[PDB]
Amino acid sequence: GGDTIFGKIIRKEIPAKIIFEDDRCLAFHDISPQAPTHFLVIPKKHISQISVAEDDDESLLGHLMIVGKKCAADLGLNKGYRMVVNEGSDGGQSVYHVHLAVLGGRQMHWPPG
Amino acid sequence: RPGGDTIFGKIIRKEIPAKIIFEDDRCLAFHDISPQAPTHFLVIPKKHISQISVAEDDDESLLGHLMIVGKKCAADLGLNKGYRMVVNEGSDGGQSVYHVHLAVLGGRQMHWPPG
Ligand SMILES: Nc1ncnc2c1ncn2[C@@H]1O[C@H](COP(=O)(O)O)[C@@H](O)[C@H]1O
Numbered sequence: 001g002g003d004t005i006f007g008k009i010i011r012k013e014i015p016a017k018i019i020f021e022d023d024r025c026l027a028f029h030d031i032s033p034q035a036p037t038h039f040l041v042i043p044k045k046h047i048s049q050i051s052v053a054e055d056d057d058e059s060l061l062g063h064l065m066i067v068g069k070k071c072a073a074d075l076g077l078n079k080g081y082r083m084v085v086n087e088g089s090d091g092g093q094s095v096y097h098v099h100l101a102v103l104g105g106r107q108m109h110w111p112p113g
Numbered sequence: 114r115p116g117g118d119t120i121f122g123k124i125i126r127k128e129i130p131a132k133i134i135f136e137d138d139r140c141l142a143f144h145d146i147s148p149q150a151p152t153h154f155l156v157i158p159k160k161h162i163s164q165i166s167v168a169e170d171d172d173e174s175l176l177g178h179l180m181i182v183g184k185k186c187a188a189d190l191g192l193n194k195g196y197r198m199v200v201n202e203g204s205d206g207g208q209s210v211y212h213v214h215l216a217v218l219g220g221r222q223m224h225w226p227p228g
Contacts, residue, residue, distance in 0.1 A: 088195020
């Protein structure tokens with residue numbers, strides 16, 4: 001899905017530790033984990049950033065969050081977690097393919113960066 | 114009651130004040146009273162859902178709508194350099210109000226890790 005490293009991961013051209021897959025998204029552990037559990041849920045559709053998501057994408061974006069919730073439960077995050085979507089330079093977005101990050105296994109702090 | 118028992122339900126029913134950015138039949142966006150960035154607002158469903166870990170499969174479109182409204186509000190507020198969206202779940206997530214909400218923070222460089 002697209003011209004980024006996340007596209008390569010979706011196409012199985014480079015490895016990742018995959019947690020879950022369906023016909024429209026992929027969940028996998030982040031290569032630079034910031035918490036004992038840290039994974040990403042990404043759409044297979046190449047949406048470059050949340051700021052350009054269209055109205056028709058509403059269901060899909062919600063699906064990323066539901067899949068994120070389910071994977072977090074499966075990975076034993078019973079004390080909680082934080083979901084994060086980064087947009088643009090101020091948001092610290094590292095790849096221009098929409099991704100929902102899920103972090104847990106430790107106390108998350110405030111402010112969130 | 115429509116909106117639930119938390120302070121966010123009271124905000125939905127206009128029983129306590131808020132600085133509202135956007136409102137429709139499914140959600141409400143309003144500024145945070147303890148901002149952690151120069152712009153910091155919340156997008157919440159009008160349907161009470163306590164936390165994302167108990168959201169139902171059928172809540173998918175609603176959850177996505179929070180994100181679309183979040184990004185539209187960010188644009189309308191001039192966050193052209195970007196922003197961070199956050200959902201806190203439970204104790205480790207730092208959740209304090211058990212009515213699910215998407216926080217949007219911007220107007221400064223956000224750092225990594227995100228807490
Ligand atoms: N009356 C209020 N109006 C606006 N924001 C509030 C109010 N009470 C609490 N908050 C914010 O709601 C957020 C709760 O999110 P969390 O702590 O992640 O559950 C915090 O950022 C609070 O500052």
